[PDB]
């Protein structure tokens, strides 16, 4: 997209339609956006579409198929170690592009559509410039960490917390996405 | 049922902008003055007025959502006009910023009170006044969110 990074969320399915769709694996709803709010029967998290593939955390999706208008879709990539899974990005979604500029200042887009700044402290870490309670970050696993330009740097994976307040976030840099595709 | 962070407000003589930041609806004193804001329940008065910092604020109206203050100190600001145009600005100082591409003063007209966002869409400041040479606005003056946070 561009800058400033602004985002909004839209719920499209309730608890009961979700359960039915999970089982039938057939979802006829229209898709829009680059980040899909996604849920299994055990949990809800995010999935980001980068370069035509809809990526998310393996610790969230497992090896599950994604419900699509044509029935369940099998994963294209699975990598228990990189903690990634990816399905062909759903029809109607828009994809992000990897960050081709190595920016040190990253922006995490939460499940509640909040863009919070994080300072990179290494290939897969960034200090949350404004510490938030863990509860707030919950549900954002698989979300994108954008550079100022609106490009994917990584996917939110885990929170670095203490006393229930996260001051940093562990993420999966887009680098692992490519290596996961090569594998 | 969308909610706006920026309200396009107007008095009898003029029109400008207001920006909800932290539950308060802020705007420039030289636009509102001590004027009270309209509500479907009648006029509601300013919670804050500060002629000095050119800042006034009433409680956020309906159909509004608050902006989050900036917490990254970025200098790559973005000004939103009353037409919803975004203008890239580089922070030249506490309350000063240089447009990355000057625009005719008319282009920024009526946007005073609007927000100056950081790369994350957070409130950096509130557009105070355009600083122009001849007919072209090259830079802008703005009320930092700290003033607002301070006023609260």
């Amino acid at each position: 997209m561009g800058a400033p990074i602004t985002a909004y969320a839209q719920q499209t399915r309730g608890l009961l339609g979700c359960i039915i769709t999970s089982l039938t694996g057939r979802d006829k709803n229209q898709v829009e956006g680059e980040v899909q709010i996604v849920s299994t029967a055990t949990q809800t998290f995010l999935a980001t579409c980068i370069n035509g593939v809809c990526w998310t955390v393996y610790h969230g999706a497992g090896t599950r198929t994604i419900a699509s208008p044509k029935g369940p879709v099998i994963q294209m990539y699975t990598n228990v170690d990189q903690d990634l899974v990816g399905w062909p990005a759903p029809q109607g979604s828009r994809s992000l592009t990897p960050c081709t500029c190595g920016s040190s200042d990253l922006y995490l887009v939460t499940r509640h559509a909040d863009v919070i700044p994080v300072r990179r402290r290494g290939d897969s870490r960034g200090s949350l410039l404004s510490p938030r309670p863990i509860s707030y970050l919950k549900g954002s696993s698989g979300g994108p960490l954008l550079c100022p330009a609106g490009h994917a740097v990584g996917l939110f994976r885990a929170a670095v917390c203490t006393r229930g307040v996260a001051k940093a976030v562990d993420f999966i840099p887009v680098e692992n996405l490519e290596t996961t595709m090569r594998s | 049922q969308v909610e706006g962070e920026v309200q396009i407000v107007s008095t009898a003589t003029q029109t400008f902008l207001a920006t909800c930041i932290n539950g308060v609806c802020w705007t420039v004193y030289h636009g509102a003055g001590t004027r009270t804001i309209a509500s479907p329940k009648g006029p509601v008065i300013q919670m804050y007025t500060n002629v000095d910092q050119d800042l006034v604020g009433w409680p956020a109206p309906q159909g509004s959502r608050s902006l989050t203050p900036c917490t990254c100190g970025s200098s790559d600001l973005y000004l939103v006009t009353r037409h919803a145009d975004v203008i890239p600005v580089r922070r030249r100082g506490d309350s000063r910023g240089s447009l990355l591409s000057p625009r005719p003063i008319s282009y920024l007209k009526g946007s005073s009170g609007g927000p100056l966002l950081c790369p994350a869409g957070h409130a950096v400041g509130l557009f105070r006044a355009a600083v122009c040479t001849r007919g072209v606005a090259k830079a802008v003056d703005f009320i930092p969110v700290e003033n607002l946070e301070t006023t609260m």
């Binding site: 909004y8 | 969308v2 706006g4 920026v6 396009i8 008095t11 001590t34």
Partner: peptide
Amino acid sequence: KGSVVIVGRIVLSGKPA
């Protein structure tokens, strides 16, 4: 001194909803 009226709104995210 009268009353400031809101004649419109801007949603920064571009949310249609």
